[PDB]
């Protein structure tokens, strides 16, 4: 008779979902650059030259982007690595002092620049000097009547100056899984971020992911394969942002544009502060341009998709961000080492049945990741700066009117920092191998 | 074929690749051991905790496979009977049709029972073999 | 019975439960692997140093048991004789009456001799077995 | 003799002492496990990284030797043929004359081929043995 | 054993530096009485009887 006996197999092809610590890998060419200069260039292991992927035939797997623990590792790594870059840099505490101020001298379009004068230590403890710098109105506040002023942070924390040799530029980081774990990529071009992916490939590391930071629009990230794709956790819930990923880029250009002078004040023995010394030309506002026809066309595609989820006769319209802090109401991004907040109200007011110019504001004192204590002073950067970027996609929020049901209004959402790279980590799942398994067959051990 | 490539195969034809999974299950540490001289030591700690976890997982499987009669073998027959309570599926359908991913969930309940039977059958078997070598 | 439960048993009846010490000898790392994300890194260092020490102890025992012929077995007969200098007690009294704790001290001195005999008997035996397979 | 003492021996007479390299390959961790409570933590980390590297080297060699038919043996015969492409030297001269240091470079190129032969020959052999135990 | 401060005491904050504050002992609201502890006499007298035994 076919008497059945348990038999063990080891190295069985089977796995389960798990939380596990991924590790970075960094471009082996960029690795040759000087220590700590961006994002662990020296300390993050240099790249494996290939994503060694294998298409897994016949398998179907439950991917979910919203629950993806892989994002939390990236967020936590970025915060940790950011702080590790600032620890060696000068704590700017001696700069927290009474300022006299006056409005800026030469031609202006509006008193956004303050010219301010104060007493500052030399290296010699007993000797201190009168000195001046420019500041933007957002960096200072008036303690008063009399023109007496302080830095904005002085009543809450002392900021570190960022070390000027370090660049914030987001190099591509690969994420890799340790032995006994594997990454799975969903390859299906029509995947909406939640459900059974019917075409899966294993790989040992991700593609390069770049740690960009921005609010309302996603910049320089990966484009969708065939068409604009829109993703939501649970679309009847107003509290959850819609992520929209474009098929084409949309090109954006942005510029400072003023000719700005660095100056050094030696606060202490081996410590110096980069004052904003002077502006060489006459003064014009920081701004960005986007090509109007491409934007007007792109929103036509976004509506074409939103119509599928909300129904064909819905009178879809956009509106700008409602109100609140500059940091949540505006585009909030870095160009070239300088921090831009831009008024996107020019883009978001279409309704549905040449270049746009977006004005901007700049801060030197900043608090990305929004800790209570930690603060950065970003030093001024010399000359004129401008940069080009691709808008990859954008974050929308749909407002919960108890209104007439024929219409929906969408607003640029501001959003949590995670979504700047959850827009990549939607395709990737991590699994733990379970290589030991048992099954019946008719054999016996000899005795 | 390459790593995991047989996972959507039937169990039968999947039975020949097992060495591929077996090698990668530890040797993948080649990535982590490839690399700052001390500074940012925390990235070293993120690697180092993953390395000890990788050897512990491998070493537990080898220990378990070694207290059964199976140390250093990828396939092994035994001497405990398959109670149909563990699965009422016939032998042919499971080796013909099912993938390993499918089979694992379909016996997930009983698995912790089966390891205890294997363990105890083996230890008394080794003592019976000493009871023989005492006079052989 | 539970972990170490036979430690005050006679050596004879203690022989049928060796697996109970064996599994707990490494898998007890389940307590230490169960956990803050970087800060207080020193407590991570206490866990981590204990983990490497635990796998080193296990590997050393397995290596020693494997330069002798015994790898993957909990009991093993061998081929070197027991000089009565190692213990003048008769076979019956030790298997009948003594506990394993009592036996260990009563042979403790000779142990490092006995391991050398076992090692040398094995390596020359493996070469004698090749000298046969060279013609078979 | 002591550790590596046979390295300038002919390969033949070097074969009867393999255990001397084998024991030291891991147990030399005795130096590092011999020892401040946290302060100067970097010296702890230099030892600790060396310890995990030492167990990984040993564990990889044991794993590789265990996907071939050889786990727990210092000598092993096999069942794959020696193509003279791997070495056109006759059998007698290599066992009579050469040191192991000399032999290693003289076959270095072919090594990664030969491990593939051994691996695949072993797995199909284990399946052929199950195909027999299905009725034996 | 029971033990008590017992005075009604006021916390006050002085902001010594940018993001740094020191907790001064600002004022006592009631009139002042000494910090003290109580133990039940018979239980102590009995307990030392056991300790001597
Ligand atoms: C989303 O899109 C909407 C629509 O464009 C934007 O709404 C505009 O927001 C701006 C900024 O808040 C508004 O401009 C401001 O209006 C205030 C109210 O004006 C009335 O009251 C004052 C005082 O009683 C009267 O003087 C005035 O005649 C009106 O009766 C003003 O108090 C503000 O003054 C400041 O700016 C002027 C600029 O010239 C200075 O002269 C002043 O000194 C002072 O600094 C300012 O004028 C604007 O009115 C809004 N438009 C509409 C149609 O409501 C949202 O701002 C936008 N969201 C984002 C995040 O951009
Ligand atoms: C979206 O993606 C685009 C493309 O990657 C980004 O745009 C680039 O941004 C980088 C900065 O992040 C720009 O690089 C800067 O270029 C300056 C000029 O030098 C370059 O160009 C001249 C000719 O114009 C060449 O001769 C020269 O070799 C360079 O190729 C540099 O001054 C900048 O800093 C360097 O110099 C200073 C001063 O010595 C040092 O302090 C710095 O450490 C550094 O060495 C820097 O190299 C680049 O030019 C941009 N390209 C374009 C086409 O715009 C966007 O920034 C990105 N957007 C976001 C939000 O991430
Ligand atoms: C920066 O540095 C200078 C020099 O250290 C400080 O100079 C201040 O100069 C005035 C004289 O103009 C000193 O006296 C006071 O002057 C006002 C009128 O200006 C008068 O009303 C008062 O009765 C008094 O005479 C003043 O003491 C002196 N300050 C100090 C601290 O010595 C200047 O104050 C510094 N400015 C800042 C913002 O740090
Ligand atoms: C540290 O200093 C700041 C500045 O004095 C204190 O916070 C508040 O700052 C704002 C902006 O300058 C002041 O204006 C008000 O802001 C709110 C923002 O929601 C806005 O709704 C109002 O229309 C108005 O513009 C505000 O008066 C000022 N003070 C308070 C009490 O809010 C901050 O509180 C100080 N913190 C410490 C610990 O000292
Ligand atoms: C992304 O695509 C997946 C399919 O690939 C969509 O899955 C949806 O899953 C829900 C699960 O609740 C299904 O909704 C309802 O489920 C209950 C049982 O839980 C059932 O009684 C109802 O009749 C209904 O089926 C839903 O049918 C399924 N498919 C669709 C078209 O939604 C997921 O919703 C997609 N998400 C987005 C944002 O596109
Ligand atoms: C911001 O305020 C400062 C005030 O310190 C302006 O910079 C220049 O400051 C010096 C003193 O430190 C001023 O005094 C002298 O002026 C004569 C003019 O003939 C010149 O020969 C001396 O070498 C010395 O500079 C000077 O007047 C002042 N310059 C100007 C144009 O006001 C600074 O320019 C103000 N504005 C900006 C955009 O920074
Ligand atoms: C972001 O940009 C918008 C641009 O729409 C700023 O809001 C206000 O926009 C209106 C047009 O919608 C501008 O109207 C002009 O106002 C003056 C007021 O005296 C009037 O003389 C003109 O006939 C015309 O009606 C208005 O200038 C503009 N307001 C400002 C202060 O620029 C919006 O303020 C920007 N966001 C933020 C946070 O400032
Ligand atoms: C979306 O934003 C744009 C720009 O902020 C708004 O465009 C402006 O709309 C008005 C009313 O339809 C246009 O008409 C009139 O123009 C004259 C001459 O400039 C002016 O005196 C009147 O007060 C009135 O503004 C105006 O020309 C137009 N501006 C531009 C630059 O084209 C638009 O209304 C917003 N809303 C929608 C639904 O598009
Ligand atoms: C994914 O699933 C397919 C379907 O099982 C696997 O491919 C091969 O499918 C054929 C049936 O079309 C299986 O049967 C054989 O078919 C040929 C004619 O096509 C016939 O000559 C043979 O006698 C036999 O009936 C075949 O067994 C099956 N291949 C394997 C390896 O079992 C495909 O292999 C699966 N993917 C992976 C990675 O295994
Ligand atoms: C702790 O020590 C006692 C004493 O050895 C263990 O209990 C059992 O003790 C009896 C003698 O009192 C041993 O001899 C056998 O007794 C039975 C009757 O119970 C008799 O039929 C046999 O002929 C024989 O004389 C018995 O072997 C012994 N049990 C064992 C397992 O050896 C007690 O078990 C010890 N505790 C542990 C956990 O080892
Ligand atoms: C270092 O190399 C020498 C040379 O091989 C090893 O010493 C011994 O050398 C002799 C030849 O000089 C080898 O041949 C045999 O010699 C004996 C007499 O000793 C003779 O009866 C035999 O007929 C034969 O000619 C001898 O095999 C060789 N010894 C060994 C152990 O192979 C020397 O041992 C080498 N050092 C080490 C530590 O390996
Ligand atoms: C910058 O210029 C503005 C406008 O001239 C000044 O603001 C006015 O200042 C006077 C005198 O202090 C006040 O009576 C007015 O009430 C202010 N107007 C407003 C709208 O606030 C400002 O004081 C100048 N600032 C500096 C630092 O020079
Ligand atoms: C951005 O700048 C480049 C160079 O001036 C130009 O070719 C491109 O058309 C600009 N795009 C926009 C949207 O202004
Ligand atoms: C909405 O439009 C799409 C595309 O033409 C069509 O497939 C769908 O049936 C329409 N649904 C309704 C209710 O009009
Ligand atoms: C800024 O001004 C200085 C002096 O005129 C000049 O050397 C420099 O090239 C200018 N930079 C730009 C971008 O015009
Ligand atoms: C922008 O999009 C184009 C599309 O062809 C791509 O080649 C380019 O690399 C993207 N990024 C930038 C910064 O231009
Ligand atoms: C301690 O305080 C509680 C509550 O007033 C009281 O019940 C208890 O008897 C007291 N004990 C002593 C030792 O005073």
Author numbering:
A (entry chain A): 31 to 139, 151 to 185, 187 to 309, 312 to 321, 321A, 322 to 396, 412 to 505
B (entry chain B), C (entry chain F), D (entry chain D): 520 to 554, 564 to 664
E (entry chain E): 294 to 309, 312 to 321, 321A, 322 to 347
Sentences from the paper on this structure:
We next obtained a cryo-EM structure of BG505 DS-SOSIP in complex with VRC33.01 Fab at 3.7 Å resolution. Similar to VRC40.01, VRC33.01 bound to an epitope that overlapped the CD4bs. Relative to the VRC40.01 epitope, the VRC33.01 epitope was smaller and shifted toward the outer edge of gp120, with less overlap with the CD4bs. Both heavy and light chains contributed about equally to the binding interface with gp120. Heavy-chain interactions involved CDRs H1 and H3, with CDR H3 dominating the binding interaction. We observed a salt bridge from Arg66C of light chain to Asp368 of CD4-binding loop. Glycan276 interacted with both heavy chain (CDR H2 and H3) and light chain (CDR L3), with the heavy chain dominating binding. Notably, VRC33.01 differed considerably from VRC40.01 in the relative positions of heavy and light chains. The orientation of the heavy and light chains of VRC33.01 were approximately 180° from the orientation of the heavy and light chains of VRC40.01. As a result, the light chain of VRC33.01, instead of the heavy chain as in the case of VRC40.01, occupied the position of CD4 N-terminal domain in binding the Env trimer, and recognition of glycan utilized a different set of atomic interactions, with the CDR H3 interacting with both N-acetylglucosamines and mannoses, and CDR H2 and L3 interacting mainly with mannoses.
Recognition of N-linked glycan at residue N276 (glycan276) at the periphery of the CD4-binding site (CD4bs) on the HIV-envelope trimer is a formidable challenge for many CD4bs-directed antibodies. The glycan at residue N276 (glycan276), in particular, has been found to restrict antibody access to the CD4bs, an important site of vulnerability targeted by many broadly neutralizing antibodies isolated from chronically HIV-infected patients. Cryo-electron microscopy (cryo-EM) structures of these two antibodies and 179NC75, a previously identified glycan276-dependent CD4bs antibody, in complex with HIV-envelope trimer reveal substantially different modes of glycan276 recognition. Despite these differences, binding of glycan276-dependent antibodies maintains a glycan276 conformation similar to that observed in the absence of glycan276-binding antibodies.
